[PDB]
Amino acid sequence: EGKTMRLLRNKVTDAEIAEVLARWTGIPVSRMMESEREKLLRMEQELHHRVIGQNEAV
Amino acid sequence: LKKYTIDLTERAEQGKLDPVIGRDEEIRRTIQVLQRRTKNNPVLIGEPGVGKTAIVEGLAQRIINGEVPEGLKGRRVLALDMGALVAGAKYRGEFEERLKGVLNDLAKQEGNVILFIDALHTMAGNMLKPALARGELHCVGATTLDEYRQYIEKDAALERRFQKVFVAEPSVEDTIAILRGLKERYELHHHVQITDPAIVAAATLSHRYIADRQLPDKAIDLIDEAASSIRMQIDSKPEELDRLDRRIIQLKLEQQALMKESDEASKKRLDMLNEELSDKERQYSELEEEWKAEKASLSGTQTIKAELEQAKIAIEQARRVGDLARMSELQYGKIPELEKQLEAATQLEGKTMRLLRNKVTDAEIAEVLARWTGIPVSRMMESEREKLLRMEQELHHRVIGQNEAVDAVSNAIRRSRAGLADPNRPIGSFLFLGPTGVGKTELCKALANFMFDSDEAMVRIDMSEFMEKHSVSRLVGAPPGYVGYEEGGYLTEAVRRRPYSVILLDAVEKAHPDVFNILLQVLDDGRLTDGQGRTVDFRNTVVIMTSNLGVRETERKSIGLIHQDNSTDAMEEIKKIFRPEFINRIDEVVVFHPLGEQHIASIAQIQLKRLYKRLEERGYEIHISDEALKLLSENGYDPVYGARPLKRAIQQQIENPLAQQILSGELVPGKVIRLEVNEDRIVAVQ
């Protein structure tokens, strides 16, 4: 199974456990795989869409 | 009378009774109450566990030992058995058939029978009244304090009849006497022995610590559970026996692995395995032979235990019924022979018993108790004076800094626990000056963890906390008899976990002089009459009182300069603002200071120890320089609060950029980080 099991992996990891818990509690699961810094570096402007200005507040 | 009532002449005559010890006051009060012409149904205020049924067993030892007075002799006392009265009831209503038949024959008996109701509070209620009120019978009762208070006072003829007797739980040496009087049944029933300091330490320490359970009840739990532990583990085979048993069963299975062979010349090596098998079988046979030798000592002492209890029961029944030749026959004759070879049997266990230990000492009590409670046994092996003189060492294990606080506060605690103040005071009469966040809560956790054994033990009071005059009514909750029996007092919660407390009475000077008088009643008398009026013992409470008067000059006078200067010129302000009575109350004046330069570096690296472990789990190791942590320090050193924007400037100045640099991909894990030295904004470099 180390050689010919290309598609399926029968052994388990901790990332599956964190994904089942993330589907449970309703926390966003996409903090790791989805690009977090691409929207987190523009949190200022995403707030500027409705709360514009206030540089020290953000 | 017969089929559903039982004469206590033959129950006390049969001797179903445990031995009793010196129960004078309650039994003589029972006599004089039972000689009243009416209300001669005495009710004993108490709970079982003081031995009220055993006090009745001892009044039956004063009937059957003849020690009752002229009033209560000749009376033929028959006990009701409701557990016998349930017999013969199939269709609905035959228990009260046989119960009112008991009212028939105890109605015709007309005073001959005193009744004893085992568990009086079984005895319904409208139908127990007319027979006693006409006078058709004669009884005695017993019940719980709270059950009694909800029992007599309301109804007219019920408080006419049922009667109060003070029966209580004894002091130290009397429970010691009860365990001495019961080590007959303990030793001669439990295959154990009992010495005197086990009884004294049991009744004494059980008297002192647990104010919950009963005496000698919890000592009966100790002798009963632990004595059966000694009997049970004596029944077990010793330790070298089953060490060798595991080794011989592994060696026999390996010999079976050696006998089944395919290649002969490689697998016929097992000769040395066979001679080692023979040697270990010889040693195991000799050790289990020693176990049977101790079982031979226990065989002879077992049958002489049986004939021993038969012999002292024989001499006591010889005292009772009175055969002439049998009394002197046993007195000079059979029983001192069994005393002498009883001593030879104690030497038989004194020379045969090597592996198994027949005698019970305090160490097996420390086994059963050390697996009862779970508090560390070293804390009982600690004394007070040793953890007073060696307090600086373990205070310098966890907490860094505060030298004159540990030494001078340690002088106040050595004086306080030594008794060098007024013993009508609380424990620590302190006065602390300094800012917040330098370790006051950490000092409460450290002292709480050392002498109080908890990382959970502190409640703190700033004077703006103050839950009000109504709030003492809030911790009593509803008055008793209203809604809220589900919770009642949260006193039960915050005092469920901590009966003591370490309290951080912040800003004592900024409070009102009424808090100089309420807190004067705190420092004096070792107890405070609170806002409700009752008072609770502060003598088991360290009254740590902190303050924030002189912040800036204390934040300066920390490095290089002596700190007695800051203490004494602080007392130049304390003498003006206080009365000299408060200066008389506290022993010394301690002022906390923000730490020195290398110790500020210790503060910042300890606040970064969370980053060392949070990151060493994820795979990052910082080796932060003193200069990057120094830019954390002097970019954190705002003279407003002290070290409180220092965490704000560490986590905000580096760690939010370090979360952007670690979480963006600039810092690759598995590599050692050194927080380097660039421009004043700090950027981590791989």
Curated annotation (Swiss-Prot), chain A:
Gene label: clpB
Record's miscellaneous remark: One peptide binds per ClpB hexamer; the binding site is formed only upon ATP-driven oligomerization.
Portion of the full-length sequence here: 520 to 577 of 857
Function: Part of a stress-induced multi-chaperone system, it is involved in the recovery of the cell from heat-induced damage, in cooperation with DnaK, DnaJ and GrpE. Acts before DnaK, in the processing of protein aggregates. Protein binding stimulates the ATPase activity; ATP hydrolysis unfolds the denatured protein aggregates, which probably helps expose new hydrophobic binding sites on the surface of ClpB-bound aggregates, contributing to the solubilization and refolding of denatured protein aggregates by DnaK.
Outcome when changing W24F: No effect on chaperone activity or ability to form oligomers
Superkingdom in the source lineage: Bacteria
Protein name: Chaperone protein ClpB
Entry similarity comment: Belongs to the ClpA/ClpB family.
UniProt domain comment: The Clp repeat (R) domain probably functions as a substrate-discriminating domain, recruiting aggregated proteins to the ClpB hexamer and/or stabilizing bound proteins. The NBD2 domain is responsible for oligomerization, whereas the NBD1 domain stabilizes the hexamer probably in an ATP-dependent manner. The movement of the coiled-coil domain is essential for ClpB ability to rescue proteins from an aggregated state, probably by pulling apart large aggregated proteins, which are bound between the coiled-coils motifs of adjacent ClpB subunits in the functional hexamer.
Record's subcellular location: Cytoplasm
Inducing factors: By heat shock and other environmental stresses.
Organism of this sequence: Escherichia coli (strain K12)
Subunit structure, as described in the record: Homohexamer. The oligomerization is ATP-dependent.
From Swiss-Prot, chain B:
Effect of R644A: Loss of ability to form oligomers; loss of chaperone activity
Sites of N6-acetyllysine modification: K16, K469
Cellular compartments annotated: Cytoplasm
GO BP terms in the entry: cellular response to heat; protein refolding; response to heat
Signal peptide residues on this chain, from the entry's feature table: none
UniProt induction comment: By heat shock and other environmental stresses.
Gene Ontology MF terms: ATP binding; ATP hydrolysis activity; identical protein binding
Region (Linker): 170-374
Source taxon at top rank: Bacteria
Keywords: Acetylation, ATP-binding, Chaperone, Coiled coil, Cytoplasm, Nucleotide-binding, Repeat, Stress response
Primary location recorded for the protein, binned into one broad class: cytoplasm
Location of region: NBD2: 384-594
Binding positions (ATP 1): G46, E47, P48, G49, V50, G51, K52, T53
Binding site for ATP 2: G434, P435, T436, G437, V438, G439, K440, T441
Entry comment, domain topic: The Clp repeat (R) domain probably functions as a substrate-discriminating domain, recruiting aggregated proteins to the ClpB hexamer and/or stabilizing bound proteins. The NBD2 domain is responsible for oligomerization, whereas the NBD1 domain stabilizes the hexamer probably in an ATP-dependent manner. The movement of the coiled-coil domain is essential for ClpB ability to rescue proteins from an aggregated state, probably by pulling apart large aggregated proteins, which are bound between the coiled-coils motifs of adjacent ClpB subunits in the functional hexamer.
Function: Part of a stress-induced multi-chaperone system, it is involved in the recovery of the cell from heat-induced damage, in cooperation with DnaK, DnaJ and GrpE. Acts before DnaK, in the processing of protein aggregates. Protein binding stimulates the ATPase activity; ATP hydrolysis unfolds the denatured protein aggregates, which probably helps expose new hydrophobic binding sites on the surface of ClpB-bound aggregates, contributing to the solubilization and refolding of denatured protein aggregates by DnaK.
Protein name (database record): Chaperone protein ClpB
Organism: Escherichia coli (strain K12)
Gene name per UniProt: clpB
Full protein: residues contained: 161 to 857 of 857
